[PDB]
Antibody
């Protein structure tokens, strides 16, 4: 079906340059106008760029004209954005959208690829096991956790038992402080589960090729 | 440029009730042709914002019948007639009839429910962390309501520590509750110097452990 996939997001030094890509499938990329929409950390949506069906006609808002540049490769069905003269302001989640001819503007979006413009350096997270003292029971259930401390940038992935445990999970949003992120996740399983069969915390920080599976032991 | 203003920023509505969102522009935007572009989007927790109403009042494919965009005048209003748990998210009105395409601030929908106390749990620092010279004590306050809840950390039966890092998930679509974690971060030395660690939710809900290991 109609699929849009943004790629290339990442950490970049100020003034640095990056290039986002948006692979469109499930529709005739050349017959549809395409756009770029960002979402700031404050969850504010900002229109970034729009380009006509046969390319050429590009529109850019006031803030990014001269630095950003939209283009498209209609043969490979790819939408591109050229980011130059980057600033901290530009740090956001970047979406690419499909225009519904004579209907609506952003008819279809993508998963989104985050780019972080900052002078901070990449730091690998520290993953710590979280279990109750002495493995102390709380009735018919047990809540386990996992703490990922001090990482940069934001993009981090955490799952339990490679995805087996998904039911009673609780991944808390990362809180930034001193140019480092901290995140945690809890999982509630019955008493007859954890002590019997170990639960593992799978953490992956792409930016630093970090990937660690920490088993929760009592 | 033309600015879109949404009211209210937050909206807590009872389940199965009716809801309305307002979005007024600083200038007239309805065209004398047949293409007034005023759209309403919804960003469900942890997902991309989807299209609901386009061209002031039209319903996009898939969008449940309960969604009606009335608009009109200078105040564009979205109307949710049968509010469901799956309708919690953030609604943003986007304008496109003026070159500088702008978006509204947003309206976070909150599903009202009966109060629910949190299932508090405290966790002592890991041996690994202590080895690196640090001690983070984590406490989880899962599935409660409303979001307004307090948590106090008490070291050695008195010390109300304040160097804590809190975090809240957004309302859960299943049960409409909230969850938060409080992580008190102190040094291995400052931690080794004490014994009891308590986590109080606020007739408070207390949870604590003793020692530095066990």
């Amino acid at each position: 079906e109609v699929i849009l996939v943004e790629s290339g997001g990442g950490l970049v030094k100020p003034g640095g340059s990056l290039k986002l890509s948006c692979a469109a499938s499930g529709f005739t990329f050349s017959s549809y106008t395409m756009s770029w929409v960002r979402q700031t950390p404050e969850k504010r949506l900002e229109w970034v760029a729009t380009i006509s069906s046969g390319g050429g006609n590009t529109y850019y808002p006031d803030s990014v004209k001269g630095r950003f540049t939209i283009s498209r490769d209609n043969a490979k069905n790819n939408l591109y954005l050229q980011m130059s003269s980057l600033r901290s302001e530009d740090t956001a989640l970047y979406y690419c959208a499909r225009y519904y001819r004579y209907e609506a503007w952003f008819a279809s979006w993508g998963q989104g690829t985050l780019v972080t413009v900052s002078a901070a350096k990449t730091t690998a997270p520290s993953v710590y096991p979280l279990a109750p003292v002495c493995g102390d029971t709380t009735g018919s259930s047990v809540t386990l956790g996992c703490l990922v401390k001090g990482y940069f940038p934001e993009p981090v992935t955490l799952t339990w038992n490679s995805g087996s445990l998904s039911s009673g999970v609780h991944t808390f949003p990362a809180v930034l402080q001193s140019d480092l992120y901290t995140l945690s996740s809890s999982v509630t399983v019955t008493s007859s589960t954890w002590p019997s069969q170990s639960i593992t915390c799978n953490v992956a920080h792409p930016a630093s090729s970090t990937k660690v599976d920490k088993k929760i032991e009592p | 440029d033309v600015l879109m203003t949404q009211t209210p920023v937050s909206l807590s509505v009872s389940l199965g009730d009716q809801a309305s969102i307002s979005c007024r522009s600083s200038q007239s935007i309805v065209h004398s042709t047949g293409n007034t572009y005023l759209e309403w989007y919804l960003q469900k927790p942890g997902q991309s914002p989807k299209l609901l109403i386009y061209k002031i009042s039209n319903r996009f494919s898939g969008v449940p019948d309960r969604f009606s965009g009335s608009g009109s005048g200078t105040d564009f209003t979205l109307k949710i007639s049968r509010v469901e748990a799956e309708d919690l998210g953030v609604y943003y009105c986007f304008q496109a009839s003026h070159a500088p395409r702008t978006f509204g601030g947003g309206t976070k929908l909150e599903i009202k429910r009966a109060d629910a106390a949190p299932t508090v749990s405290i966790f002592p620092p890991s041996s690994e962390q202590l080895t690196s010279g640090g001690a983070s004590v984590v406490c989880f306050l899962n599935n409660f309501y409303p979001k307004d809840i307090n948590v106090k950390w008490k070291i050695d039966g008195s010390e109300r520590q304040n160097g804590v890092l809190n975090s809240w998930t957004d309302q859960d679509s299943k049960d409409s509750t909230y969850s938060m974690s409080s992580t008190l971060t102190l040094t291995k030395d400052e931690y080794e110097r004490h014994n009891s660690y308590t986590c109080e939710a606020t007739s408070p809900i207390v949870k604590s452990f003793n020692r530095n290991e066990c």
